[PDB]
Scaffold this motif. Structure first.
Motif, PDB file in Angstrom:
ATOM      1  N   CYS A 193       3.842 -24.971  69.843  1.00  0.00           N
ATOM      2  CA  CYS A 193       4.231 -23.931  68.910  1.00  0.00           C
ATOM      3  C   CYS A 193       5.738 -23.744  68.986  1.00  0.00           C
ATOM      4  O   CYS A 193       6.321 -23.763  70.075  1.00  0.00           O
ATOM      5  CB  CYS A 193       3.504 -22.621  69.208  1.00  0.00           C
ATOM      6  N   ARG A 194       6.367 -23.576  67.826  1.00  0.00           N
ATOM      7  CA  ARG A 194       7.815 -23.585  67.716  1.00  0.00           C
ATOM      8  C   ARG A 194       8.307 -22.321  67.032  1.00  0.00           C
ATOM      9  O   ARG A 194       7.595 -21.712  66.229  1.00  0.00           O
ATOM     10  CB  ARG A 194       8.289 -24.802  66.938  1.00  0.00           C
TER      11      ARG A 194
ATOM     12  N   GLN B 197       2.888 -19.013  61.480  1.00  0.00           N
ATOM     13  CA  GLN B 197       2.363 -17.767  62.033  1.00  0.00           C
ATOM     14  C   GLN B 197       2.887 -16.551  61.261  1.00  0.00           C
ATOM     15  O   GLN B 197       3.439 -15.610  61.825  1.00  0.00           O
ATOM     16  CB  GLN B 197       2.735 -17.678  63.506  1.00  0.00           C
TER      17      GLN B 197
ATOM     18  N   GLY C 229      12.665 -12.684  58.586  1.00  0.00           N
ATOM     19  CA  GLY C 229      13.236 -12.861  59.903  1.00  0.00           C
ATOM     20  C   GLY C 229      12.551 -13.990  60.655  1.00  0.00           C
ATOM     21  O   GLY C 229      12.169 -15.010  60.082  1.00  0.00           O
ATOM     22  N   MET C 230      12.391 -13.791  61.959  1.00  0.00           N
ATOM     23  CA  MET C 230      11.850 -14.836  62.813  1.00  0.00           C
ATOM     24  C   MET C 230      10.350 -14.985  62.596  1.00  0.00           C
ATOM     25  O   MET C 230       9.635 -14.005  62.372  1.00  0.00           O
ATOM     26  CB  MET C 230      12.149 -14.520  64.277  1.00  0.00           C
TER      27      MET C 230
ATOM     28  N   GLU D   2      12.346 -28.935  64.850  1.00  0.00           N
ATOM     29  CA  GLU D   2      11.955 -30.059  65.688  1.00  0.00           C
ATOM     30  C   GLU D   2      10.688 -29.710  66.456  1.00  0.00           C
ATOM     31  O   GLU D   2      10.634 -28.685  67.140  1.00  0.00           O
ATOM     32  CB  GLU D   2      13.079 -30.427  66.652  1.00  0.00           C
TER      33      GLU D   2
ATOM     34  N   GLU E  29      13.505 -10.517  54.171  1.00  0.00           N
ATOM     35  CA  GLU E  29      12.980  -9.482  55.047  1.00  0.00           C
ATOM     36  C   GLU E  29      12.152 -10.066  56.188  1.00  0.00           C
ATOM     37  O   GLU E  29      11.859  -9.356  57.158  1.00  0.00           O
ATOM     38  CB  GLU E  29      12.157  -8.494  54.200  1.00  0.00           C
TER      39      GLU E  29
ATOM     40  N   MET F 135       6.942 -17.851  63.882  1.00  0.00           N
ATOM     41  CA  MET F 135       6.502 -18.990  64.668  1.00  0.00           C
ATOM     42  C   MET F 135       5.823 -20.020  63.778  1.00  0.00           C
ATOM     43  O   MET F 135       5.249 -19.699  62.735  1.00  0.00           O
ATOM     44  CB  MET F 135       5.545 -18.547  65.778  1.00  0.00           C
TER      45      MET F 135
ATOM     46  N   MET G 203      13.523 -19.425  62.023  1.00  0.00           N
ATOM     47  CA  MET G 203      14.176 -18.311  61.348  1.00  0.00           C
ATOM     48  C   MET G 203      15.140 -18.894  60.327  1.00  0.00           C
ATOM     49  O   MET G 203      15.704 -19.971  60.546  1.00  0.00           O
ATOM     50  CB  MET G 203      14.926 -17.419  62.347  1.00  0.00           C
ATOM     51  N   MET G 204      15.308 -18.192  59.209  1.00  0.00           N
ATOM     52  CA  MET G 204      16.287 -18.592  58.208  1.00  0.00           C
ATOM     53  C   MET G 204      17.705 -18.455  58.749  1.00  0.00           C
ATOM     54  O   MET G 204      17.983 -17.645  59.634  1.00  0.00           O
ATOM     55  CB  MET G 204      16.153 -17.737  56.952  1.00  0.00           C
ATOM     56  N   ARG G 205      18.602 -19.273  58.208  1.00  0.00           N
ATOM     57  CA  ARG G 205      20.028 -19.100  58.451  1.00  0.00           C
ATOM     58  C   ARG G 205      20.476 -17.809  57.783  1.00  0.00           C
ATOM     59  O   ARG G 205      20.531 -17.729  56.553  1.00  0.00           O
ATOM     60  CB  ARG G 205      20.809 -20.292  57.917  1.00  0.00           C
ATOM     61  N   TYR G 206      20.781 -16.794  58.583  1.00  0.00           N
ATOM     62  CA  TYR G 206      21.133 -15.503  58.018  1.00  0.00           C
ATOM     63  C   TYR G 206      22.530 -15.526  57.424  1.00  0.00           C
ATOM     64  O   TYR G 206      23.468 -16.064  58.016  1.00  0.00           O
ATOM     65  CB  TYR G 206      21.045 -14.397  59.064  1.00  0.00           C
ATOM     66  N   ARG G 207      22.655 -14.927  56.249  1.00  0.00           N
ATOM     67  CA  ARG G 207      23.927 -14.741  55.575  1.00  0.00           C
ATOM     68  C   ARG G 207      24.075 -13.269  55.240  1.00  0.00           C
ATOM     69  O   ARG G 207      23.086 -12.596  54.931  1.00  0.00           O
ATOM     70  CB  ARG G 207      23.996 -15.576  54.305  1.00  0.00           C
ATOM     71  N   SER G 208      25.299 -12.768  55.318  1.00  0.00           N
ATOM     72  CA  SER G 208      25.562 -11.404  54.904  1.00  0.00           C
ATOM     73  C   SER G 208      25.422 -11.296  53.385  1.00  0.00           C
ATOM     74  O   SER G 208      25.557 -12.294  52.675  1.00  0.00           O
ATOM     75  CB  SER G 208      26.962 -10.982  55.347  1.00  0.00           C
TER      76      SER G 208
ATOM     77  N   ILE H 119      28.738 -12.345  51.730  1.00  0.00           N
ATOM     78  CA  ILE H 119      28.997 -13.769  51.592  1.00  0.00           C
ATOM     79  C   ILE H 119      28.015 -14.420  50.625  1.00  0.00           C
ATOM     80  O   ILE H 119      28.343 -15.453  50.031  1.00  0.00           O
ATOM     81  CB  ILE H 119      29.007 -14.451  52.975  1.00  0.00           C
TER      82      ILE H 119
END
Lengths: 153, 153
Positions: free
Chosen positions: B77-78, B136, B57-58, B115, B55, B60, B81-86, B89
């Motif tokens: 500051c970078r 963050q 998502g993105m 990075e 839940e 910082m 986000m997680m690699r989203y999977r359906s 899948i």
């Protein structure tokens, strides 16, 4: 053809404090080759099929042109939207290409190129160093943002 | 290539008092080999497929550069986000690779490298000792956080 990678800072909150923030750019030789040969630039955003991303719909994106004298020389806001797919065709593309997504070869995202400008950096005297990029949303979810100062007249 | 393990302290509550807290780092020989040979650093976070984690998502992440004189020399500051999977899948990857996850050989998590910097520690006179890292968010769940001062120009 030369790729350009940017760290879009997501405004220190998930809540919309201001907007995402940008402008790291330094290729002075490609700056000069853009001006002398009338090249253009295009941004490309990699974003998944998240439910928040699919609920997003249309969003604006905008970019600026500040020169070596840090004077604003160009300003263009652009429209953007994901390639919409029906949920039926997402299920069918899931079931058909299933071992590709299992083996992690396609990754359920979309590359959305947004053409920003068509010509060079307005003069040979003071060309543009960095590009102030912002996305006019806060519910957007993406992996990375990449400009492409392409060698195209 | 030299790994670096950090104890990210989760702000003495599950509720967001401030933020997670960091900066244990001491490899002075690798500090000097970073400066003299223009190496870079990358953080890597190991986080599961928790429902609170999915839940999220993105988010910082941000890092600092305090030298031997404890002067702030770099700050970036970078975005992450997680690699989203359906969920389809995820179910298919569950049913197909099931005896691997039963035998505990894959462990339903993701390594997310972020990075942070590209070049060395800003001078040879006073290079950077520790790196003030913070994420963050407060709903994030992870196993461990590992920096990598990689030997890459």
């Amino acid at each position: 053809r030369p790729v350009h990678m940017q760290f879009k800072t997501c405004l220190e909150t998930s809540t919309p404090c201001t907007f995402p923030h940008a402008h790291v750019s330094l290729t002075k030789k490609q700056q000069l080759l853009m001006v002398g040969q009338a090249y253009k630039v295009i941004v490309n955003i990699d974003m998944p099929e998240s439910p928040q991303n699919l609920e997003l719909g249309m969003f604006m994106v905008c970019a600026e042109m500040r020169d070596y004298d840090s004077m604003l020389r160009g300003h263009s806001c652009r429209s953007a939207m994901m390639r919409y797919r029906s949920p039926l065709i997402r299920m069918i593309s899931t079931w058909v290409l299933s071992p590709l997504y299992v083996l992690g070869w396609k990754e359920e995202f979309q590359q959305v190129p947004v053409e920003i400008f068509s010509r060079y950096l307005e003069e040979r005297q003071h060309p543009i160093t960095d590009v102030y990029v912002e996305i006019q949303s806060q519910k957007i979810q993406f992996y990375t943002v990449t400009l492409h100062i392409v060698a195209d007249f």
